[PDB]
Amino acid sequence: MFSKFFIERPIFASVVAIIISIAGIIGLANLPVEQYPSLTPPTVQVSATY
Amino acid sequence: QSLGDEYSIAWSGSAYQEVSSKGAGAYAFVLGMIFVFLILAAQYERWLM
Asked: CA separation (Å) from A3 to A11, A15, A19?
């Protein structure tokens, strides 16, 4: 019954996949782009001059 | 033009935000309309309606 609801309603199914894809492009633009999701140990540096 | 090259211009408050504006609202409004279009298209099962 679940998949037939969509087979009977062609525009509903495509509406949904357009939303999924629009959300996708909003998402990729927002997402950070990096080489590795690796976590580097966070560091604090203290410098003094004499 | 009036001030010298030695001068420089910076902004504060409302002006700063307007100069540093990502046009975010505009993109959001277009998306909102497109979403409204599609969600009523689903209700009526018609693209035109």
From this structure: 14, 15, 18
Method used to obtain the model: cryo-EM
Give which of B29, B37, B48 is closest to A15, Cα–Cα: B37
Chain A: give the shortest CA distance to residue B42, in Å.
5
Contact (CB, 8 A) for B39 and A18: no
Encoded tokens for A8? 């009977």
Residue written as tokens 């279009």? B37
Please list, in sequence order, all residues whose beta carbon lies within 8 angstroms of the beta carbon of residue B4, skipping any fewer than 6 positions away.
Answer: none
* Angstroms from B22 CA to nearest CA on chain A: 13
Six-digit token string for B28: 């959001």
CB contact A6 to B (< 8 Å): no
Tokens 């033009």 sit on residue: B1
CB A6 within 8 A of CB A13: yes
Contact between B41 and A11 using a beta-carbon 8 Å cutoff: yes
